Symmetry: D2
Subunit: 490 residues, 4 copies
C-alpha cells in the first residue's frame, strides 16, 4: 500500500484532512502521500517546543547534547539505506550522488557539530578598573528557543541536518518544514529522533507548502525564536518581512549565479573533472553550481571541444544504476521553468554547444521531468540567461583575456554565493579567489565543504554565516556576564 | 548669526532647501538650524561611498586603517571641548555625564576597534582529503560596501562611534544619519574626518528624520550594503522590512524593560551607589537603565527608605554645574510621553515613593523638558507601567522572596537587553546572572562596557551581537577561500 | 605460574635478561615479574618509532588519528575490569578511587584529545605589505618525532594517558616507561594498542628504573624528540640536564606543597567533604593534595573537631571493599619515608590531632605499606614538615586572621602546583584564587580536571602547560608557512 | 672623550673596576668602554627586580603596560638616530640595514606587543558536573618574576626588544645582558626606560661575557624566573643545564644551517633579489640566512652565472654610505672563524664561484674585520662546510632534480630554523614549504616577520615558540582558576 508521510508534533504522529502527493520525477509516479499541517498544528508545534525547554531538554548539559547528536547520527547510519531510498525516490537523484553526498554529509552534520560543541570555549575578557578593581566578562550561551527550519528540495536531508544539528547542539527545540517535493528524509529523521529517545517537543515536523501553509505559519508565529531558510532569495525577502514583526534573527542561504574562472595554466584534466561536477552534479540543482563560465582565450576552443565530448559521455539514465551520473530535475514544474530558460536562450541568440532539449527514453521515464545537460555560448554578459539563476544543468561559456577583466566580470552580479577558480599559478590563485565577492571561493576544486568554516552568501545570496562557531553563535542567545570584583573592604 | 549643521557628502558641506531647528531641552531655546537631506542627496552619498571604495580607501591596508582610526581619535580628543559643548547643548546632559561617559567612550570606540583590527587573526582550518591531498581554508574579510548608520538621541556621539568605528575598520564607507534631536556631535565628527584627511565619500553625513526623510531613504536604498540601527524596537521592525527587499544584513540594539535584582546579602552601600545610576543616569534615558527593581523582602523597607533619601539629594539642576547629576529629558515630546506614563501609573493605582512630577525653577528652564526622578511601588507584574518601556527616570520597585521566583519575574518580558544583579554570594551571583535572558548581565555593577565582548539584545531588544570580533565579522563580507593542494603528479 | 609484564617494542613482546618483581602494598606479596629493558632495547624502540613515522602512521590524517584515539578508548572501556584489577593490585588503590578516577579519567584522556584534535584550527594571520602585496601566514603542525614518556606510580594509567593521548594525536610515536612500582596498566595499554591495530613502532613500552635503566636511557637518547615527565622535581632537574645535550623540548609536572585556604564563611559541610579528599584521596599521594591547611580563626576549633571526627570514620581497610576510602601507600620504601616525616614532626614539636602511626590488622596486611591518616598542628610556617612535600595522608593545619596574610603564607613556598580555596563570598573567591601562585586554583572544589584547560606547575612544580591546545602545541612541531602573494606582473 | 656604557640596576647607573673595550669592526678602533658586572651586581639586579614587583610595577594593569610599551616605543623613535649611530658603530652594519631593519623592527616590537596585550582574551571553558552543578575555568595570567635576557650580537636591538617587549607586557622585571660586542643599543634602551619613567628595578642592564661573567651569573641565579636566550646552540645546552637546578622555563632560538630551494618555474628576477638578501644581508650573520642552496637542474647554470654577477655588483664599502649593501663581520674573532671555514672549503675540494677572500681597501678599514661575499659549489651533502653553521656571507649551491629529493636533502640536518622556497606553482609551494622541518618556511620571500605568528626553531635550532600569544604565554605564569558553582541549597 502507499506510504504515508505524517507530521510529528510533541512526540506524536499527526495526520491531516488535507493531503497531497509525493511525485517522483523519475517517471511522474506517486510514491507517498503527505499530511498537511494547518495553522493550528504549527501553533501546537511551537508551544510543544517551548514546553520541551521547560523539561528534560532544557536541563541537558552540552556534554549530553554532544552524546544525543552522536546517537542521532549513529541511528541515521544504521538506517542509511532507508534514508537513501527515500531521498532517491523523492528527487530522482542518482545513486552516485545520494550515496556519496546527500546521505553521508547529512549524517556528518550531526557528528561535526557534536565535535564543535564538545570543544566550544567560553568567550571571555578581563576589564581593569581603577582602584585595583576589575571585572570578569564571560559569554554564557543559552538556546534561542524554538527555531523554525524551512528546508529546500535540492539537498533535502543534507541542508535539513545542516540547520537541525547546530540548532539542537545549542539546546533549541525545532519546528521543521521540508519541501513539499521532498518530505521523506525529514520524516525518517523524525523517526530517528523518536527511536533514540529525543524528548517529545524537541524535534517537530510539519508538512506543507510555503504561502498560506506551514512555511508561512512558522515564519509569522510570534513565539518562534529564529528562522533559518535556504532557497529562493525572493522568498527570503518574504520571510525577513515576517520576521520583522518581532525582530527575529534570520539566517539565509539564497542561491546565486555563480562564476567559474578557468585559466590557461590550469591542470586541464583535473579541471574538466571538477567542472563537470560544478555544472551538472544533481542536474545542476546545487545552489553552488556554476552557470557562468569564463575561460581564458588560449584554451577556450579546447575547453569547448573537450567539454562537449565529456557531456556526451555523461550517463543520463536510470538513477538506481551505479554508474548513472545525472537524473531528472526535481519536478515537472521546475523542468518547465528550466526549459523556458532554454527557450529564452534561443530567443536571445545563443549558440548551443550541447544539449538544449529533453532525453527520450521510450518508456515511463518520459512522463518524468528530465532535461539534457546543456552548454550555451555567444551571448553578452548582459543577456538574461547569463545573469538570471536558472538552477538547472546549464552554463554560458565565454572567453576572457585578462585577470583584471575576469574579476570584474565574475563579480558583476547582484548575487554572491560561490566561485570556482582553476589555475596552477600560486600568486594568481590566492589573488583572484580572495577578490571573488562570494561566501565560498574554491581553487582547483568545487563543493568541498569544511563544516568548521564560515559559509554563507553575499548580497542577494544570503545573510549571515554558519559553519563552526558561526553556527553555534547564531542558534544561541549570548549573555555577556560581567562580574565586578571589588577590592577587600576595610 | 545662527549655528548651522550641514550635510557632508563626498567631501563637501551641503546646505538644503528643507531646514529644521535643534532645540536644547534645558530651556527650549534654539541651538542651531539643521539642513535636512532629500532623497537625491542620500542617493549621492551612497554613490559617493561606493566610488570611494574604488579609490584610495578601497586600497587601504588594515594597518593603514588602524592608523586612520587612531588619527580620528586623536583629533576628537584635541577637540573634546567642542564635542562636549555640542553634546550638552543638544541633550541637556549634565557635565558629570557627558565629560565622563559620552565623550570619553565616544573617543575610545575608535581606539578600541583600532586595537582589535590590528590583531585580528585569519579564521582557518585544514581539510584532509583522500590520496594524500588536502585543502587549506582561510576566511578573507572584505568590506561589505556602504553601511547605513541610523543613530539615536540618548547617547548621540557614543553610539554613533560604536558603529562607525568598526564599519571603517572593516574598510566600508558609511552614510550616517544622527537623530534630528541631536545633530551636533555627528556634524563635528564629519569635521574631524575632513580635518584628518579621510578620503571623500568614506564618511557621509545626512541630517533629517525617519519617515519620508533621510532615515527612510538610507533604509530603502537598494545599494546600501548593511544597516545598523539603535533605537525603538518598532522602528527596528520597519527598517528590517525595508532591508528585506535586498536581504541586507542588519544589526539592531532596541531598548528594553530591564530588571534589577537586589538580594539581602548585597553590599548595601555599593548597591545604592550603582542603582542610583542604573535608575537615573542620563535621566533614565540610557537603553540599559533598570525600570523594574526586585528587592529581597528582608531588605525591602530599608531599600525604600534609603533610596528615597538618596533621591532627595540628587541634584536636578543646571547641567553645566560640575555637581549636577540629572538634567532634563531630551525633548518636550519625550517629556510629554514620560509624564503620560506617570499619569498612567496614578491611574493603575501606584504608590509614589518619590517624584511623579516636574521640577519648578522659576526661570526659563521651566520652558524646558524637565521631569523628577520617580519611584513607584504597589503594582502587579502585569500592570502597563511595569511592563512597557518608559525610557525616563523611573522604576517600579517590588519585593521578592526566592531566587527561582525572581529569575522567573525578571525574565517575564518580551524584551531582553540587560540586567543588574547585586549579591555577595559567589554561587548565587554566577547562577542568577547567567540565567537572565539578556545580552548583558552585570553583577555588582551597571553600565560597564568592555568593547571586546559581545553586546546586543535578546527578543525585541535586538538582532545580532557587536563588540570585538563580533563587530568586525558583522561589518565585513567573509569569503572562505578553499584551496585544494594536490599531491605531486 | 606467575604473571609476566613484558616490553613491547616495534609490535613485538620482548622478555629480558634482567627482571624484577611488582609487589602489591596491600600485603607485600608478588603480583608479577617485570622485564627490564636494557639500553639496546630502548635504542631499538626509538629507532622503531622513527621508522613508524616513515610508514602508515606518518601518513595518517588528523581525522584518522581522531578515529584511532577513539578506538583505543573503546577497547580500553571493553577491558576496563582488567585495567581496574591491574591498577588496584599494583597500587593498593581502593575500588572507590580506581573505578571512579583512575580508569574513567584514563579512558577519557583519549576521547578528549580526539575531540580537541577534531576541531583544532590553523593559527593564521595576514601580513600587509607595500605595493598591494601581502603575505599569508599559517602554522602547519607536524609531529615532533618520538616522544619519551616517563610515568609516575601515583596515578599510573591516568597520567600515562594524559601524555600518550596528545602525543599520538599529534602524530608522534612514543617510548613509554611506567614506574617500576606500577607496570601493569601500561602493559595492558600496550595490549590495547596491538589489539586495535596501531602500527608497530608507534607505541613502545620499556620497563625498568630511572638511573642506569630505561628512564635514563630514554632521557639521554640523542634521537628522542621530546621528553614529558611527571614526578619528583629533582628527577625533573636530572631529565632536563639530559635533554640539554640536544636542546630537547621538555614538559614537566613535578609535585608540590599545596595550600588549602578555608574561610569562616565557607559552606562548612561541602568544605569538609572536599577537604577529606584533598587530604586523603589516594592516601594523600595525589600530587595535587593539600599538605598545608590555613583555616580562618573563628572556625579553627570547629574545623579541628569536625575534621578529627571525620577521620575516625574514614575506612582504612581492604581496598576491594566498595566502602573503603583509603588503602596503603604505594610501597614499603615510601611508607618508610612518610613515617620518617611523622617522626620528624614529633621532633619538631607537633601536636597530632589524628593519626601519626600505622594501622594494625592482625593479618597479612601488616606486611604491607599502611599508614594512618594524620593531622598535625602547632608549628611555624618555617618547620621542615610544614614546607617539605611528604606525599602522604597528612596536613599541617594552622589558623589565619586576614586575607592578605593568608595569601602571603599560602604563596610562601618554592613550589606552585595547586591550591583549593573555600568561601561563599563572591569577590573574595575570585580575588584570592587568582593570586595563588599555582597552576590550578580551585574554589569550593578540589581535583576537578577540565582536559581543555591549561594545566601545569609554577616554580619547582613544573615547566610548561598541557591541556587543550597547550598539549597539541607542545607535542607538535609548528612550521609557520609564510607565502608572499605578489601583485600581478 | 670616550663613551662609557655603564650598567643600570634598580634605577642607578653603576660603573665597575673591571672594564673592556667596544671595538668597531669597520676599522678595529675603540668606540666605547664597557663596565663589567660581577656576581654581586647581578644578584643586586635580580633582587631589585623582585622588589619592583612588590611596588608600582606589580600593581600595573594590562592597560597601563600597553601605554608604557607605547611610551617606550615613542621615546625610541624620538631618539632613533642615537640608536642607529650606536648600532652601526658596534656592528659595522650598513645604513641600508640598520635604518630599515634593526632600528624600525626594534621599535615595532614594543608597539606590536602593546597591541597583542591590549586585545589578549581570557582562556576559558565551562565544565558541566552532575546534579546541575558546573565549574567555570578561566586562566589568570601573572608575571613569572624576573626574566633573564641574554641577547646576541648579530641583531642587538631587534632581538633584545623581541624578548624585553613581551616580558614587560606580562608584567615581569628583566635583567638583560647584551653581547660584549654590542653594548650600545642596550644601554640606550636603559636610558629610554629611565626617561619615560619605568619604575626602578623593572629594567636592569648588566654587561659582560658569558662564561665566568654576567651571562652565566644570570642563568645560574636561583631566583631568576625564566631565561630567554638567542645564539649558539651549544651555549643553549649550557644554559639549559643551569636552568635544570630550579626547573626554570627556557625559550631558545639557536641558529641553524638553513636551506633555500629554487625551482625552475620561479620568478627568476624576484628570486635573485630575495636570495641576495637571504645570503648576504648583515654579511650573512642572520640566524635565518641560507647557507645551503638547492637549484633545480635546468636553471642551475643560469643561477650560478647571474648570482656571480649580482655579487660583483654588491657594494661592500663604507657602512655609512647610503648605498653600501654589506659591511664587515662583527669582530676579528668571528672573521677568523669564517675564514677558517673558507679554508676548510678549499681543503674539502670546493669550487669558488665568488669571493673566498678579504677585500683590500688600502686604508684603516684593513684593520677591521671584513670578508668577501662567497659562493662555493662542487661538494657532497656530507662535506663539513655544507653541514656546519658558518654564520658568514657564504653558501654552497648544488643542483637537484626532483621535489621528493630536495625535501629530503633540505631536511637532512640536525638543525631546523628556517627555509626559503621559490616557485610559481601553487600546489608545489604549499606542499614543499609545509614539509620543511623548520620553524619558519618562506615562499617567494625571505625574512618577513609577522610578530603575531609563532616563531622558533626545531631540533638543535631552539625550544618553544614566541610571537603573538605564544610570547605572552611563555613570559606569563598561567593559573587556571576553577570555580565550582553549586545549585541553590534547600
Amino acid at each position: 500500500s502507499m506510504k504515508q508521510y505524517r507530521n510529528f508534533v510533541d512526540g506524536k504522529w499527526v495526520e491531516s484532512s488535507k493531503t497531497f502527493q509525493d511525485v517522483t520525477p523519475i517517471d511522474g509516479s506517486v510514491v507517498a502521500v503527505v499530511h498537511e499541517a494547518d495553522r493550528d498544528l504549527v501553533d501546537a508545534a511551537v508551544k510543544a517546543g517551548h514546553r520541551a525547554l521547560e523539561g528534560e531538554w532544557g536541563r541537558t548539559t552540552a556534554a549530553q547534547r554532544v552524546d544525543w547528536l552522536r546517537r542521532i547520527a549513529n541511528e541515521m547510519e544504521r538506517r542509511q539505506q532507508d534514508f537513501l531510498d527515500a531521498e532517491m525516490a523523492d528527487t530522482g537523484k542518482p545513486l552516485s550522488m545520494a550515496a556519496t553526498i546527500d546521505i553521508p554529509r547529512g549524517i556528518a552534520n550531526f557528528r561535526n557539530f557534536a565535535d564543535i560543541l564538545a570543544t566550544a570555549p567560553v568567550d571571555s575578557h578581563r576589564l581593569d578598573l581603577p582602584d585595583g578593581a576589575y571585572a570578569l566578562n564571560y559569554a554564557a550561551r543559552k538556546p534561542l528557543g524554538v527555531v523554525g527550519v524551512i528546508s529546500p528540495w535540492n539537498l533535502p536531508l543534507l541542508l535539513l541536518t545542516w540547520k537541525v544539528a547546530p540548532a539542537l547542539a545549542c539546546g533549541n527545540a525545532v519546528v521543521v518544514k521540508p519541501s513539499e517535493d521532498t518530505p521523506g528524509t525529514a520524516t525518517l529523521l523524525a523517526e530517528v529522533m523518536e527511536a533514540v529517545g529525543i524528548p517529545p517537543g524537541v524535534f517537530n515536523l510539519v508538512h506543507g507548502f510555503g504561502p498560506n501553509s506551514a512555511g508561512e505559519f512558522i515564519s509569522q508565529h510570534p513565539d518562534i525564536s529564529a528562522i533559518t531558510f535556504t532557497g529562493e532569495s525572493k522568498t527570503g525577502s518574504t520571510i525577513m518581512r515576517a520576521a520583522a514583526e518581532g525582530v527575529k534573527p534570520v539566517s539565509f542561504e539564497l542561491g546565486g549565479k555563480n562564476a567559474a574562472v578557468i585559466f590557461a595554466d590550469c591542470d586541464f584534466e583535473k579541471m574538466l573533472d571538477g567542472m563537470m561536477r560544478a555544472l551538472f552534479l544533481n542536474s545542476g540543482q546545487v545552489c553552488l553550481c556554476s552557470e557562468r563560465v569564463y575561460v581564458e582565450r588560449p584554451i577556450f576552443d579546447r575547453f569547448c571541444v573537450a567539454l562537449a565530448e565529456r557531456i556526451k559521455a555523461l550517463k543520463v539514465d536510470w538513477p538506481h544504476e551505479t554508474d548513472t551520473q545525472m537524473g531528472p530535475l526535481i519536478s515537472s514544474k521546475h523542468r518547465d521553468k528550466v526549459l523556458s530558460y532554454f527557450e529564452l536562450a534561443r530567443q536571445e541568440g545563443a549558440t548551443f554547444l550541447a544539449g538544449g532539449g529533453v532525453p527520450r527514453f521510450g518508456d515511463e521515464r518520459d512522463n518524468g521531468a528530465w532535461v539534457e545537460p546543456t552548454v550555451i555560448a555567444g551571448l553578452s554578459d548582459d543577456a538574461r540567461v547569463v545573469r538570471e539563476e536558472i538552477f538547472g544543468p546549464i552554463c554560458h561559456v565565454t572567453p576572457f583575456d585578462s585577470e583584471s577583466e575576469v574579476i570584474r566580470r565574475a563579480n558583476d552580479t547582484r548575487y554572491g554565493l560561490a566561485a570556482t577558480i582553476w589555475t596552477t599559478n600560486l600568486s594568481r590563485a590566492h589573488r583572484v579567489s580572495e577578490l571573488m565577492r562570494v561566501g565560498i571561493s574554491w581553487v582547483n576544486t568545487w563543493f568541498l565543504r569544511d563544516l568548521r568554516t564560515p559559509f554563507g552568501g553575499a548580497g542577494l545570496s544570503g545573510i549571515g554565516r554558519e559553519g563552526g562557531m558561526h553556527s553555534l553563535n547564531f542558534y544561541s542567545e549570548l549573555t555577556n556576564v560581567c562580574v565586578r570584583i571589588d577590592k577587600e573592604s576595610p
